[PDB]
Amino acid sequence: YLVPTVIEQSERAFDIYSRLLKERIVFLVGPVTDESANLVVAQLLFLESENPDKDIFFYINSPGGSVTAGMSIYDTMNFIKPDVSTLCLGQAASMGAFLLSAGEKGKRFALPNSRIMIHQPLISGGLGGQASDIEIHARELLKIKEKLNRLMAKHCDRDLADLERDTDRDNFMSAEEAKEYGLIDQILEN
Amino acid sequence: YLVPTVIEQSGERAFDIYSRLLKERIVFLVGPVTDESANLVVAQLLFLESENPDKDIFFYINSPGGSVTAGMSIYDTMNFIKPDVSTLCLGQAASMGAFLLSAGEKGKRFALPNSRIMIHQPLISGGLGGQASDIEIHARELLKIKEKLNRLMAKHCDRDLADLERDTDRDNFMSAEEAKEYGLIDQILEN
Amino acid sequence: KLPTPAEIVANLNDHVIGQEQAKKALAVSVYNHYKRLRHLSKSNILLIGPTGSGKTLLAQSLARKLDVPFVMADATTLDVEQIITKLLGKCDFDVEKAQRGIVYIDQIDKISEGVQQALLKLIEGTVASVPNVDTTNILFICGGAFAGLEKVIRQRTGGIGFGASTKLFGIVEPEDLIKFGLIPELIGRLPVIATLEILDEDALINILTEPKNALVKQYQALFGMENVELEFEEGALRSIARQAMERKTGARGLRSIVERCLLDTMYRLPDLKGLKKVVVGKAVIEEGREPELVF
Amino acid sequence: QQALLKLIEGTVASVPPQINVDTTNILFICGGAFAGLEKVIRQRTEKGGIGFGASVHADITKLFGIVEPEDLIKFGLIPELIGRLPVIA
Amino acid sequence: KLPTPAEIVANLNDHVIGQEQAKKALAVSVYNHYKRLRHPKAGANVELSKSNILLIGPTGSGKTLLAQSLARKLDVPFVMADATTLTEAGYVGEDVEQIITKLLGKCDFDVEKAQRGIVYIDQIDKISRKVSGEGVQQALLKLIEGTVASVPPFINVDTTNILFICGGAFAGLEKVIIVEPEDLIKFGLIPELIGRLPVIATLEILDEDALINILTEPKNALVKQYQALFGMENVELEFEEGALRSIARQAMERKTGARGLRSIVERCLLDTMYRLPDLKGLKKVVVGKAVIEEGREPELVF
Ligand SMILES: Nc1ncnc2c1ncn2[C@@H]1O[C@H](COP(=O)(O)OP(=O)(O)O)[C@@H](O)[C@H]1O
Ligand SMILES: Nc1ncnc2c1ncn2[C@@H]1O[C@H](COP(=O)(O)OP(=O)(O)O)[C@@H](O)[C@H]1O
Structure with a gap:
């Protein structure tokens, strides 16, 4: 894709995403990968430096992705001093929903027709080799499953038992249902 | 991916966001460890030593592993250069990524709270085809590497070689707390 | 020496x-x-x-x-x-x-x-x-x-x-x-x-009431040039202390605020009769409120 | 000034004079x-x-x-x- | 001549x-x-x-x-x-x-x-080269x-x-x-x-030893300046060699150099100049290595 160039008056020419980063807007678009997650981390670290007190706006339009990659974002969001406000555009599914719910409480937003989906993790990696290796990877996946449900339950102010039921199979929610659930705080209109 | 551009105030200088963080002595190892990704880390480590031999270098690791020889080029560069190399685990540090994490300066090895650290014996360092004589040679070289990695890991962790030999037999996944107790990291960051 | x-x-x-x-x-x-x-x-x-x-x-x-x-x-x-x-x-x-x-x-x-x-x-x-x-x-x-x-x-x-x-x-x-x-x-x-x-909101109250040239004393004199006593509530002194601090002018901002909050009564004061006391409550400092007029 | x-x-x-x-x-x-x-x-x-x-932007x-x-x-x-x-x- | x-x-x-x-x-x-x-400027004399x-x-x-x-x-x-x-002739500047x-x-x-x-x-x-240049x-x-x-004042x-x-x-x-x-x-x-x-x-480029000599050797050296101020009160000011080494090292490690030697001396002596004229019976003030390097107070010798 051709990324448009915009001019900032101060003139400085930016690509439109660097221009929005100047306004403390970080985009997570598409699958969460090591590379796309590390750019989010680099941007979050950079923005904390520019101004530790101002909010960071983390716009999420993502079907999910790697758990470890999403956790690098998650821990960076929680570590850095400035509040990270999260907004769901289009969809926030799987780790995208996790990172959406991970925004600063009171500053988690969704657009009216966005779709939010939460579910237990799938393969975090293949389970081949010997039954001993398969046992190890099955145990690691269960620990991740419990960790994600526990952190989700914390984000949503719900019981761990509720997240265990609700993430058993793909649980699709409207912005209103996500607000009632506790994944987001507000729904934007204008 | 499009790498954002950021402006440094000094006049102004425009950087890509990774060059901007290198200016702050932050070196990233993201994804598999390859000859090319390892040599960039080495080039950055060498460059940062020249800029300031005394200041710490911050080596952020989010890697599933990779080549042993490529990881060893980083490892020897970390140990050689004068400035301490602090290591931080983001997301995961597995295989050679865990090795390089544990290779950070003692007292300056960090992990984020929900990071995952995995240690294991090496797999194929190269295929074992050809004649039984060639297979014997490559099997012997792999065993020497296996022993070298366990020995260096045991040194990093202040553990016995016998402990690393048990614990690296099969993929050993650890939370940041377990890695701290094991001796792979020194501290866990929160805020 | x-x-x-x-x-x-x-x-x-x-x-x-x-x-x-x-x-x-x-x-x-x-x-x-x-x-x-x-x-x-x-x-x-x-x-x-x-x-x-x-x-x-x-x-x-x-x-x-x-x-x-x-x-x-x-x-x-x-x-x-x-x-x-x-x-x-x-x-x-x-x-x-x-x-x-x-x-x-x-x-x-x-x-x-x-x-x-x-x-x-x-x-x-x-x-x-x-x-x-x-x-x-x-x-x-x-x-x-x-x-x-x-x-x-x-x-x-x-x-x-x-x-x-x-x-x-x-x-x-x-x-x-x-x-x-x-x-x-x-x-x-x-x-x-x-x-x-920078002075905090308690230090600015001492600015308002302790010095020989303190602002409260200045404006008490002004009202005292008529047969009227002027009195400030502790809450009034705290809210004005913050208002000056919130402009990042420290002690300087206190004068502008005292003049602001009292002017709406100082322009009436010459016509009001039987008035003995004017009390500046925190409401006067904070909002478009009248001081207690004691007749 | x-x-x-x-x-x-x-x-x-x-x-x-006409001091x-x-x-x-x-x-x-x-x-x-x-x-x-x-x-x-x-x-x-205006932030x-x-x-x-x-x-997003006068009221003079x-x-x-x-x-x-x-x-x-x-x-x-x-x-x-x-x-x-x-x-x- | x-x-x-x-x-x-x-x-x-x-x-x-x-x-x-x-x-x-x-x-x-x-x-x-x-x-x-x-x-001389005359005749065949070479210019x-x-x-x-x-x-x-x-x-x-x-x-x-x-x-x-x-x-x-x-x-x-x-x-x-x-x-x-x-700047250049047609531009704002000197x-x-x-x-x-x-x-x-x-x-x-x-x-x-x-x-x-x-x-x-x-x-x-x-x-x-790489109106102002x-x-x-x-x-x-x-x-x-x-x-x-x-x-x-044209001249x-x-x-x-x-x-x-x-x-x-x-x-x-x-x-x-x-x-x-x-x-x-x-x-x-x-x-x-x-x-x-x-x-x-x-x-x-100045090194740590040069900084030490700057503290004590010049006519207007810092140590001499403060010894005179203490002298006004009939009090002797003494620096240990470790103090001078510590001042110089701090000025160097802080990357200020000679410009920062006054800052360090003024800081360490401030809590004595404040009391000095009232400390009657005092004869000597000693700035030791720890006084410069650590959060310590000068030694008062009575
Ligand atoms: N720390 C302080 N102690 C006492 N009075 C102060 C202090 N800071 C400011 N003031 C008051 O500010 C008033 C105006 O002085 P001004 O010249 O504005 O001070 P500044 O130099 O801070 O601008 C004075 O009446 C003075 O009493
Ligand atoms: N050899 C020296 N002896 C005494 N003081 C020195 C010496 N070298 C530098 N200084 C100190 O450094 C300060 C600045 O000196 P200067 O030569 O103007 O630096 P620069 O030439 O970089 O502007 C002076 O106040 C002086 O006291």
């Missing part, structure tokens, strides 16, 4: 609220200056701090304590020798006091080269000629709101990437003042650096 | 159309930006209604003159 | 500890430049032209101090210029003729002294050598006989390289200006 630094701060305390570190730093630099004059370079002083922190008063209070004439000066009104004209007027042109007096130069941070060099002409001992004063033995107190000096220091001491960053003003070095835009030669004559913190 | 300071505060003027005039008790009303002042005030008070929740009456000495200094009047004009209408 | 270069250096030794090679270069150039001025100095050295090494310490020995007018305030205006002002317009004075021009390294070098060409400046000032010491922190010059014009040209100076500064004098 020459009061010791302990005696000098003992009475600086009667005029300046807070800024304990700046007061002892000043008490020593002034003692050394006037002890030197009773006898190898001299040492002037720079005051770094926010607007409304008391830099000017601290300089004035000192001159009173040391029994010397005091002249007010401003770096941004640059001609510099007319500060000596003023200093002489303060001592009836007896140069023996003017040549040992104190000059306070405000807004030094705003001229951060021609003006700085003119200031240096007087600070480096010269002879001013006004309608002859040897400035060698004049003590100069310079200061200003070096807000950008915080950035000069942050640039060198957490850091970007896992990092949080008068805490930094306390470690100002001549190099930081140079990076800020001041001329090294002017800095070299102002070796003592002292810092003043 | 510098020449006026001594006139706005107390001095003694010397003026031609030493004490200016201490003369009241001064100053004024003008600070045309660029609305821009100064917006630069200080505009790009994104959700950013202020509101702007002049919130003028503070800081704006007049940025506009271009010397602090010594502003500090001697305490009442802004 | 004149001081011989040896006497000029002896005076420089009482103010600058270090930079020996530049001391020779400055002492000889001045001695000769004031022998040229005193040479003696001057030799200007380009003084190259690190920031904070003592370039200015040498120039001032030197001027004070001759009783000549002396000014310091900053090459980065200068003209190169403002250097002469200052030199002339320092002597109350006595051109017979201004025209025989010394000018130190700093920040030559900052007007390189090359244009300034070009404007200076005809000021360094002989021209008649039109100077307001006609012949700069032919003015000695110029120009210098700067040419850090990029160590990278380019024993400085030769080839290196200065690659740095970014124009050959026309290089050829007018025939003598190159160089300063060494």
Whole structure:
């Protein structure tokens, strides 16, 4: 894709995403990968430096992705001093929903027709080799499953038992249902 | 991916966001460890030593592993250069990524709270085809590497070689707390 | 005699609220200056701090304590020798006091080269000629709101990437003042650096009610020029203290606010009859509310 | 502006005859159309930006209604003159 | 008569500890430049032209101090210029003729002294080619050598006989390289200006030992200054060798150098100067190693 160039008056020419980063807007678009997650981390670290007190706006339009990659974002969001406000555009599914719910409480937003989906993790990696290796990877996946449900339950102010039921199979929610659930705080209109 | 551009105030200088963080002595190892990704880390480590031999270098690791020889080029560069190399685990540090994490300066090895650290014996360092004589040679070289990695890991962790030999037999996944107790990291960051 | 630094701060305390570190730093630099004059370079002083922190008063209070004439000066009104004209007027042109007096130069941070060099002409001992004063033995107190000096220091001491960053003003070095835009030669004559913190909302209540020229007393006099008593509620004094603090003007903002909140009653006061007391509640400071009018 | 300071505060003027005039008790009303002042005030008070929740943009009456000495200094009047004009209408 | 270069250096030794090679270069150039001025000007006598100095050295090494310490020995007018305030003739900034205006002002317009004075021009390294850069070098060409400046109080000032010491922190010059014009040209100076500064004098970078000597050896050394202030109260001030080593190390590690030696001394002595006149019976104040290095108080000896 051709990324448009915009001019900032101060003139400085930016690509439109660097221009929005100047306004403390970080985009997570598409699958969460090591590379796309590390750019989010680099941007979050950079923005904390520019101004530790101002909010960071983390716009999420993502079907999910790697758990470890999403956790690098998650821990960076929680570590850095400035509040990270999260907004769901289009969809926030799987780790995208996790990172959406991970925004600063009171500053988690969704657009009216966005779709939010939460579910237990799938393969975090293949389970081949010997039954001993398969046992190890099955145990690691269960620990991740419990960790994600526990952190989700914390984000949503719900019981761990509720997240265990609700993430058993793909649980699709409207912005209103996500607000009632506790994944987001507000729904934007204008 | 499009790498954002950021402006440094000094006049102004425009950087890509990774060059901007290198200016702050932050070196990233993201994804598999390859000859090319390892040599960039080495080039950055060498460059940062020249800029300031005394200041710490911050080596952020989010890697599933990779080549042993490529990881060893980083490892020897970390140990050689004068400035301490602090290591931080983001997301995961597995295989050679865990090795390089544990290779950070003692007292300056960090992990984020929900990071995952995995240690294991090496797999194929190269295929074992050809004649039984060639297979014997490559099997012997792999065993020497296996022993070298366990020995260096045991040194990093202040553990016995016998402990690393048990614990690296099969993929050993650890939370940041377990890695701290094991001796792979020194501290866990929160805020 | 020459009061010791302990005696000098003992009475600086009667005029300046807070800024304990700046007061002892000043008490020593002034003692050394006037002890030197009773006898190898001299040492002037720079005051770094926010607007409304008391830099000017601290300089004035000192001159009173040391029994010397005091002249007010401003770096941004640059001609510099007319500060000596003023200093002489303060001592009836007896140069023996003017040549040992104190000059306070405000807004030094705003001229951060021609003006700085003119200031240096007087600070480096010269002879001013006004309608002859040897400035060698004049003590100069310079200061200003070096807000950008915080950035000069942050640039060198957490850091970007896992990092949080008068805490930094306390470690100002001549190099930081140079990076800020001041001329090294002017800095070299102002070796003592002292810092003043911003007053909080409790200190500003003492500004309102304790000094001989306190604002509450001024406006009580105004109402007292009629047969009317004026009284302020504690809450009123707290809300006005915050309002001034929220403009980052410190003590300065208190005057504008007292005038603001009372004007709506001061224009009625000449027509109201039988009125004995006007009470300023916190409601008067905060909203379009009338004070309690006691008839 | 510098020449006026001594006139706005107390001095003694010397003026031609039909005379030493004490200016201490003369009241001064100053004024003008600070045309660029609305821009100064917006630069200080309007927190505009790009994104959700950013202020998006004039109400000149509101702007002049919130003028503070800081704006007049940025506009271009010397602090010594502003500090001697305490009442802004 | 004149001081011989040896006497000029002896005076420089009482103010600058270090930079020996530049001391020779400055002492000889001045001695000769004031022998040229005193040479008879008549008949067939050869006209003696001057030799200007380009003084190259690190920031904070003592370039200015040498120039001032030197001027004070001759009783000549002396000014310091900053090459980065200068601009091209048609632009906002200072003209190169403002250097002469200052030199002339320092002597109350006595051109017979201004025209025989010394000018130190700093920040030559900052007007390189890589209105504010090359244009300034070009404007200076005809000021360094002989021209008649039109100077307001207009005064006609012949700069032919003015000695110029120009210098700067040419850090990029160590990278380019024993400085030769080839290196200065690659740095970014124009050959026309290089050829007018025939003598190159160089300063060494200060180390920790130099900082210690700066604390105690010079005529106006810091330790001597404060010993005098304590002397006003009949109290002796003593520094342990560890304290002087600690002051110097801190100034070095904090990357301030000699400029920061006053800050450290003033801080450690502040809590004694505050009490000193009231501490009757006190005879000596000792600043030990720990007092400088750690959060410790000076030792009071009664
Ligand atoms: N620390 C302080 N202690 C006492 N009074 C103060 C202090 N800071 C400011 N003030 C008050 O501010 C009023 C106006 O003085 P001003 O010249 O504005 O001070 P500054 O130099 O801080 O601008 C004075 O009446 C003075 O009493
Ligand atoms: N050899 C020295 N002896 C005494 N003081 C020195 C010496 N070298 C540097 N200094 C100190 O450094 C300060 C700045 O000197 P200067 O030569 O102007 O630095 P620069 O040349 O980088 O501007 C002076 O105040 C002086 O006290």
